[PDB]
Amino acid sequence: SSYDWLNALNNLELLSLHSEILTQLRSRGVIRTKNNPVGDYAEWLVSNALGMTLLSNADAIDADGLKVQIKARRVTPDNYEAADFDYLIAVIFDETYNILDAYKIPHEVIRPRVSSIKEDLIVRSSASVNEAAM
Amino acid sequence: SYDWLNALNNLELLSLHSEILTQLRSRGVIRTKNNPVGDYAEWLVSNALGMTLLSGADAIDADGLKVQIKARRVTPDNPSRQDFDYLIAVIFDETYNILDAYKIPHEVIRDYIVNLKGAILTDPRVSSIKEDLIVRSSASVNEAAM
């Protein structure tokens, strides 16, 4: 909830804490690499919530066998593909990683036909997380 | 250490991860959210040696030469050590203390993906700059990297 206490850490403590977090997430299987943690988390969220299988390194195959792209973005004050997939799922997080929006974008949409999946993703992800905690 | 991280949920871990990076960006230590170990290396070498960071080359040094800056943190998984005038290569241990820091002229890279092992480190055109980083850094920075 609160992060002003970060002001009291030195840069080396922040950096060591940062890596321990990524070690913790990797050990839980939430992120598969240290390179893009927000993207890896979205992929873990969407795959578990919607019954998709992740691909190592399309990002996933869904429950009907379609090829899916998963991209994520976090809202703050601060600032082609030539590969085939059937649709993109785009997740937008707030500062504390609550889902602001989630979009299903068929590949055909380039540069309307895209629909929100926000409610379905939140519901099935909340069931997923609470179930796993058991 | 930070064993209390085990008591957080994944949403809290990621929120903290992003707030840490925002804190570092606000201090000018990290410049982008993508390469924090590399951005820290650049902050370290630039402040120690009086370089200006660029948004091809990563920095201009105090004599106007173009510098590439690369960093690596050695972890339990592996300890492998793998237009610009020279490259500066920093190697951190797990807790971000500097194991080694090398100055590698572009000419040396041509003659040799570069492996900081064996003959490249004994090439007279290559120098360690760890000692220079320690001397020339401020006592505030130096107290972190002892």
Residue numbers in the entry:
A (entry chain B): 7 to 63, 68 to 89, 100 to 131, 155 to 177
B (entry chain A): 8 to 62, 67 to 93, 104 to 133, 144 to 177
Excerpt from the paper describing this PDB structure:
The BisI family of restriction endonucleases is unique in requiring multiple methylated or hydroxymethylated cytosine residues within a short recognition sequence (GCNGC), and in cleaving directly within this sequence, rather than at a distance. We present the crystal structures of NhoI and Eco15I_Ntd (N-terminal catalytic domain of Eco15I) in the absence of DNA and in specific complexes with fully methylated GCNGC containing dsDNA. Both proteins are homodimeric, with each domain involved in target sequence recognition and catalysis. The crystal structures show that the modified cytosine bases are recognized in the context of double-stranded DNA, without base flipping.
NhoI is a typical BisI family member, Eco15I contains an additional domain at the C-terminus of the protein. We truncated the enzyme to the shortest active form of the catalytic domain (containing 173 amino acids) to increase the quality of crystals and refer to this truncated form as Eco15I_Ntd. Crystals grown in the absence of DNA contained either an NhoI dimer, or two Eco15I_Ntd dimers in the asymmetric unit. In the Eco15I_Ntd crystal structure without DNA, the relative orientation of the protomers is very similar to the orientation seen in the DNA complex. The region of β-stands β7 and β8 is disordered, so that DNA binding channel is open from the ‘top’, presumably to allow the enzyme to load onto DNA. However, the hairpin of β-stands β7 and β8 is much better ordered, likely because of crystal contacts to adjacent molecules. Together, the data suggest that NhoI and Eco15I_Ntd can latch onto DNA thanks to an opening of the DNA binding cleft, and due to flexibility of the β-hairpin that closes the DNA binding cleft at the top.
